[PDB]
Amino acid sequence: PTKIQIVFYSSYGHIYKMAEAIAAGAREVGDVEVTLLQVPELMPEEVQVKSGIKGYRAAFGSIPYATPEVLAEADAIIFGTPTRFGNMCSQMRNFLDQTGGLWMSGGLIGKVGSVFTSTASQHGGQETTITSFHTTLLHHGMVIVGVPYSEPGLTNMTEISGGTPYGASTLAGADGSRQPSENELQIARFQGKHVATIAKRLANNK
Amino acid sequence: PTKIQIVFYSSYGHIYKMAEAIAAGAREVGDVEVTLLQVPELMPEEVQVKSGIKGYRAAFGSIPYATPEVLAEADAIIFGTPTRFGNMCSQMRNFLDQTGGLWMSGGLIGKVGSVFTSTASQHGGQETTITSFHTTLLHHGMVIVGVPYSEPGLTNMTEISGGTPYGASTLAGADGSRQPSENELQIARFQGKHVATIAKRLANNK
């Protein structure tokens, strides 16, 4: 069966929710194993307690932790990260910085890579976070898949919404209060289904 | 006086309107000369008639045409382009491809470069069009100015809006029907005022 890994960091739960929607879309293709994996936290125990994040992260506390070498087991990996000033977050960056051995062994070469994100504002890194993420995936020799415009949600012009042709996204607001909308989750579902379709066509032809 | 040039291509008038708002913001600083300049059209006379664009472009028909060498006269240049698949349009690209002589003479080195855009969808090249534009400005040795988050419009979370920390923007919709909103025009005004402030501080210190 086609193995799809969804590897994400989340502080407030936005990326976690999008991840579940991505997973749901992927499972629609059939002959597919979808696995959610979270990246290790870096933030100090205390800062974590004081921020409330410790509480928020607990909502998905039972998700197993990703490791650099487990990535080699997948046919596709869809990475999720909140933006930090238009780049991936340091938690995701440290995790990927750890894939040096995976790199020299060629472990991700020819695998399908895709990305999704979340931001506080409408155009603060909705796109740049994804495209800079793509750079690292290309270093790993992955094939890059985004979200085609055959998904109607990408052209929605009546509600504020994330979702880019580079990859799905969601808006969290300044204070992280806004939860992902149905349009945003529909776009993520499509991404998971689309990535899984492509990975399966590649995987069934070793 | 500090010379600010606003150099743009527009098909349907969206970029033209944003350009006027950028100009208005710039004129707020004082001791500043602001000049609007349009880039030459490439589209065939016939395709132009049949598209209705010939009509739309006429609304700003009296704007003088930019040339590669006139750019050397400015202290800052703020470039406007509609997106084409997350890059600047071919009209703007051909114009900039013409600046080879300007490049070897160093004519734009140390000048303030800024960019604004327009797109059909919320995250189809709102950011990527600007950042890829920045690359060409860096080749010309320009100092890059975007839109700081001290402009409240960048964090607007109640209306669909363009405007990025990389540069102002507007949404035109799938059929180009949506006109620039007040929030979008306010952000452009701020960009013009902010670019002009910086250029003036640099220009008054040769």
Next chain:
Amino acid sequence: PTKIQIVFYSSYGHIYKMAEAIAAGAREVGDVEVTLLQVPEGSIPYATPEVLAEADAIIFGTPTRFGNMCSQMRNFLDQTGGLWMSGGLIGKVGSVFTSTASQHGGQETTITSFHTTLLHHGMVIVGVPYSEPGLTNMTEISGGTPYGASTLAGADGSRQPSENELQIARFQGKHVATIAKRLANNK
């Protein structure tokens, strides 16, 4: 058979020579049909937007213009609006190669900004994996990036594409074709 189109613009011939190396790499894989097409401002036919729909993969070649594709390529792609709204390139393999005057003036940025456009068309993006040894060459001035093959033209365009640069290009052709073929044979 898998259909590969190599769509390019070339002034000095650097891009054309790279294209020939890409095509030879692609034609190594077997049951692969490669067509070279040039974009309009010599016996290479001109590309049209409609013909692109017939490919399983398109490998685009452009010299840089200040870190973007050239206006000739930009104008060509600006004519693919019809293809876009019909979904004509969705799921097809996209790949890019370039040429530049200087060692780091747009070797990378020209390709990555090109990728943006291929993503708008719903394409699947392929670069050059580091299993190609030429990417880590540290003994001779060389183009070639993980994002796609490249060549160095020099200030006056006198510099010929090197053997290292062409072999990277050959690899990109073979690798892109191998990917396209696996997709093409699994409709």
Next chain:
Amino acid sequence: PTKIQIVFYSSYGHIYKMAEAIAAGAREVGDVEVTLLQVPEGSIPYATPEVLAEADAIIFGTPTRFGNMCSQMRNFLDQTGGLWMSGGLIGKVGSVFTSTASQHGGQETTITSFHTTLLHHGMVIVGVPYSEPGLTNMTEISGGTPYGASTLAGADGSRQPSENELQIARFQGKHVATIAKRLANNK
């Protein structure tokens, strides 16, 4: 006086050597105060987010990690939330330099993605203009981009930064300082 901070992470010393060249370039201009600060995982003090507010310009140095800044730099910048909402870096000059194992594996993309973050902080971005002859060197393998200075470390990190690469770095320091100073003296 104009205050320049050079904030960097260095493993092998390549980035540190580049920083020393940037600082020497900056200190050429006169009435310029340059401080080197390193980001946390040696007698260079550690950077903090609050000290950055005291600079007129910040020049950031990072080795690449697959075409992005390294996690140590990323984590440091992720702690600048307070600075951000207070507007503490708005209008300050920002500039970047890097180091990579291979000739086109993130020489450019590492810098341009760093620029994104500096733009979120409202900074004014400065690269390296082509009036610096080293940028067009075509005789020796060399780093140095119009986006910012760079050095090549090699696969094992054995390669020393060359004289061409350091002179480009020196230029970037001088050029950034010259810009910062003109702004600093025109409040």
